[PDB]
Amino acid sequence: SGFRKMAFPSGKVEGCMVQVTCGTTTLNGLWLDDVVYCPRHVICTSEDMFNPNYEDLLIRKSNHNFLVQAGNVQLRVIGHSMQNCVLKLKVDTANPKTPKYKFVRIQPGQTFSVLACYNGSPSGVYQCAMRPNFTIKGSFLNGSCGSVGFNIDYDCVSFCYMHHMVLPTGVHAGTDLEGNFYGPFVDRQTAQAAGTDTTITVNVLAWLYAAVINGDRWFLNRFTTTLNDFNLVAMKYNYEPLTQDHVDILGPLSAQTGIAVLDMCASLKELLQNGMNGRTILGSALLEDEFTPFDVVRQCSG
Amino acid sequence: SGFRKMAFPSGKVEGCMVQVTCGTTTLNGLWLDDVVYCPRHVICTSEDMFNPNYEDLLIRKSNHNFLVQAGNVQLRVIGHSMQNCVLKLKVDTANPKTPKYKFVRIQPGQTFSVLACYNGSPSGVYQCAMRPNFTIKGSFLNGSCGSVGFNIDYDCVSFCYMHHMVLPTGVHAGTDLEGNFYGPFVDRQTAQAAGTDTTITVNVLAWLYAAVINGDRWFLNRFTTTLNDFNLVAMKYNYEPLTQDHVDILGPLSAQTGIAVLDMCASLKELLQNGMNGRTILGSALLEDEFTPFDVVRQCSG
Numbered sequence: 001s002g003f004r005k006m007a008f009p010s011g012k013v014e015g016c017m018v019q020v021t022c023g024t025t026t027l028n029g030l031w032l033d034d035v036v037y038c039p040r041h042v043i044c045t046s047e048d049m050f051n052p053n054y055e056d057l058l059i060r061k062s063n064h065n066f067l068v069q070a071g072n073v074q075l076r077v078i079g080h081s082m083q084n085c086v087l088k089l090k091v092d093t094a095n096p097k098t099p100k101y102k103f104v105r106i107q108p109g110q111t112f113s114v115l116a117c118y119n120g121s122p123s124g125v126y127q128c129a130m131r132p133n134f135t136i137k138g139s140f141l142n143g144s145c146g147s148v149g150f151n152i153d154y155d156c157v158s159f160c161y162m163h164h165m166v167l168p169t170g171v172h173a174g175t176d177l178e179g180n181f182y183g184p185f186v187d188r189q190t191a192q193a194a195g196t197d198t199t200i201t202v203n204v205l206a207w208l209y210a211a212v213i214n215g216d217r218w219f220l221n222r223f224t225t226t227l228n229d230f231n232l233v234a235m236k237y238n239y240e241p242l243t244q245d246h247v248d249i250l251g252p253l254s255a256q257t258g259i260a261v262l263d264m265c266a267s268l269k270e271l272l273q274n275g276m277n278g279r280t281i282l283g284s285a286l287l288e289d290e291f292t293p294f295d296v297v298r299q300c301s302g
Numbered sequence: 303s304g305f306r307k308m309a310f311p312s313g314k315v316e317g318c319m320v321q322v323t324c325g326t327t328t329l330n331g332l333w334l335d336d337v338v339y340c341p342r343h344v345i346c347t348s349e350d351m352f353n354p355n356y357e358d359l360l361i362r363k364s365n366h367n368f369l370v371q372a373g374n375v376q377l378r379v380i381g382h383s384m385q386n387c388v389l390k391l392k393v394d395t396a397n398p399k400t401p402k403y404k405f406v407r408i409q410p411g412q413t414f415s416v417l418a419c420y421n422g423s424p425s426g427v428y429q430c431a432m433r434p435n436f437t438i439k440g441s442f443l444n445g446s447c448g449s450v451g452f453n454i455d456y457d458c459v460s461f462c463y464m465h466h467m468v469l470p471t472g473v474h475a476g477t478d479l480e481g482n483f484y485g486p487f488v489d490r491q492t493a494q495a496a497g498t499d500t501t502i503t504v505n506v507l508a509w510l511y512a513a514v515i516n517g518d519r520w521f522l523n524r525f526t527t528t529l530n531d532f533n534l535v536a537m538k539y540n541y542e543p544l545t546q547d548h549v550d551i552l553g554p555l556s557a558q559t560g561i562a563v564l565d566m567c568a569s570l571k572e573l574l575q576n577g578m579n580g581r582t583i584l585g586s587a588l589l590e591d592e593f594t595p596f597d598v599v600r601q602c603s604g
């Protein structure tokens with residue numbers, strides 16, 4: 001019973017956060033086995049951040065220019081390399097708290113947990129979605145660079161996000177753990193705009209099913225729609241199109257509630273056209289799109 | 303808005319979760335030093351759950367009737383006692399992952415992180431507020447009994463909530479770590495109704511300060527009020543009256559913005575009497591009441 005934004009327990013990741021410093025520049029790193037991963041922006045000085053030539057800056061660096069602190073222990077760097085926008089510091093000590101882990105690149109519309117950290121210390125945890133325009137709407141302050149996002153599946157941590165920067169609209173951009181940005185962004189201190197964001201339609205539908213499972217039905221109706229006719233209306237409102245795969249994924253929620261997927265599409269179509277008339281769904285005045293069908297099933301089965 | 307419900311990192315609590323089983327009744331417990339804390343409901347058979355005689359259920363029980371497991375490893379119970387609605391099981395091993403900790407009883411309005419657990423295994427973490435009617439709008443399934451709520455200040459975990467039961471409306475009820483229920487509930491499997499809820503005034507005020515901090519301040523009027531006058535008006539709109547402690551925890555935000563607490567009460571009074579008139583605050587037409595003054599500073603300032 002109930003439905004809330006839920007993050008994975010963050011303990012397995014907390015044991016991996018460290019602080020990395022070059023000169024006066026400092027951010028968070030991820031210590032797995034004998035490697036620390038962190039944004040390569042750390043090698044920038046105040047004058048480099050605007051337009052860094054990273055290969056130039058890195059070749060001028062020695063191992064002892066990197067100071068890595070785990071708690072109050074200093075870790076000795078014995079090698080360094082760059083993979084795209086991620087710096088890899090080889091250290092002489094393996095992290096005994098290293099969990100079983102994978103690096104994955106997540107798809108837009110999928111969710112993950114963010115462990116926000118400052119100076120290598122974990123500060124808070126919360127759930128985010130990869131937006132269709134490759135930004136994330138996180139909660140990050142100065143010093144959060146290098147914080148990571150992840151999912152956990154049977155004691156294996158799949159790291160999918162490393163935080164790099166804040167955009168002028170206050171949304172956030174980062175890379176996978178291979179150092180490739182999500183979206184058309186680049187790691188320099190310039191004002192960067194994202195593409196137009198769209199709403200994750202399959203997630204909104206999942207969250208409507210959550211609302212029904214928790215006893216709210218005011219938005220349901222008796223109208224009918226085809227998948228294509230729903231997608232025409234959805235595109236009009238800058239909603240992502242709904243695929244047959246998405247319809248299939250919503251299957252369990254349809255079975256549970258007895259509401260056909262296309263019947264819930266008919267309900268969403270009306271909400272897009274009429275609005276909510278000051279009413280709320282699961283306490284929200286806006287249509288929530290950062291719950292996947294798996295997130296709803298996980299919280300609402302039974 | 304840039305505001306998200308953020309949990310504390312859960313690792314310090316994850317290392318304390320265990321499963322406790324009596325016969326087939328099984329739930330979650332909290333292992334700190336050489337004591338495991340858990341709801342006394344675990345000693346009920348199904349026929350006991352409706353109207354248990356705990357004293358009589360406990361006199362029949364011996365140490366060897368309690369199965370306490372960390373993962374699949376059994377912890378031998380060497381003493382047991384009842385304190386209000388919590389059972390305290392003395393075990394023969396001091397938990398090596400015990401953090402610095404305290405037991406605290408919170409007030410309505412205060413927020414905390416919940417580590418939802420099933421069979422001793424943490425499943426997710428999210429932020430909750432204690433409602434004025436002493437329920438929490440959590441997210442809990444069967445098997446969640448004994449999950450705990452907590453805050454972390456510096457490196458000390460303040461435990462404030464242990465989950466006991468779901469109410470007919472789907473909200474949740476439980477105790478502090480001394481076994482004293484929040485609210486008028488008792489640990490019987492009966493349909494107990496929560497009283498009518500109200501809005502957490504101190505947290506709405508914190509939210510208005512957060513809006514001011516971010517430059518959204520159209521709602522600041524030119525008036526002030528006395529605390530007594532504001533309290534009397536607030537109750538007529540199903541808002542909670544303010545306490546002297548409430549005024550004091552608004553102090554840092556009042557100092558940060560230079561807006562006197564009673565001036566902000568006058569501004570909230572005007573919103574109550576007139577409404578938003580089609581206009582929004584931090585992008586929402588709803589006033590948020592589950593961010594405490596500390597949450598606001600935590601998310602604006604760090």
Ligand SMILES: Cn1cnc(Cn2c(=O)nc(Nc3cc4cn(C)nc4cc3Cl)n(Cc3cc(F)c(F)cc3F)c2=O)n1
Pocket residue numbers: 024025026027039041042049140141142143144145163164165166186187188189190
């Ligand atoms: C408000 N906010 C929200 N998210 C963020 C993340 N973020 C950050 O934490 N730090 C950044 N720049 C740095 C400045 C430093 C000053 N010192 C002494 N050390 C510093 C280290 C960093 Cl990383 N940035 C900006 C930023 C970071 C990048 F990785 C990048 F490629 C471009 C950028 F403009 C930042 O956004 N802050």
Ligand SMILES: Cn1cnc(Cn2c(=O)nc(Nc3cc4cn(C)nc4cc3Cl)n(Cc3cc(F)c(F)cc3F)c2=O)n1
Pocket residue numbers: 001326327328329341343344442443444445446447466467468474488489490491492
């Ligand atoms: C849907 N939901 C949301 N929160 C909860 C919490 N909750 C719970 O997890 N378990 C409960 N009863 C038990 C049944 C058991 C069956 N087996 C095999 N083992 C069991 C252990 C428990 Cl604790 N309850 C009900 C409940 C638990 C209490 F502690 C109490 F005092 C009164 C109650 F009615 C429950 O609410 N479920």
Ligand SMILES: Cc1ncc(C[n+]2csc(CCO)c2C)c(N)n1
Pocket residue numbers: 046047049050142
């Ligand atoms: C945290 C943080 N880091 C860097 C800058 C950028 N900055 C400050 S002075 C200067 C010119 C070189 O001295 C630059 C690029 C910032 N604003 N905040």
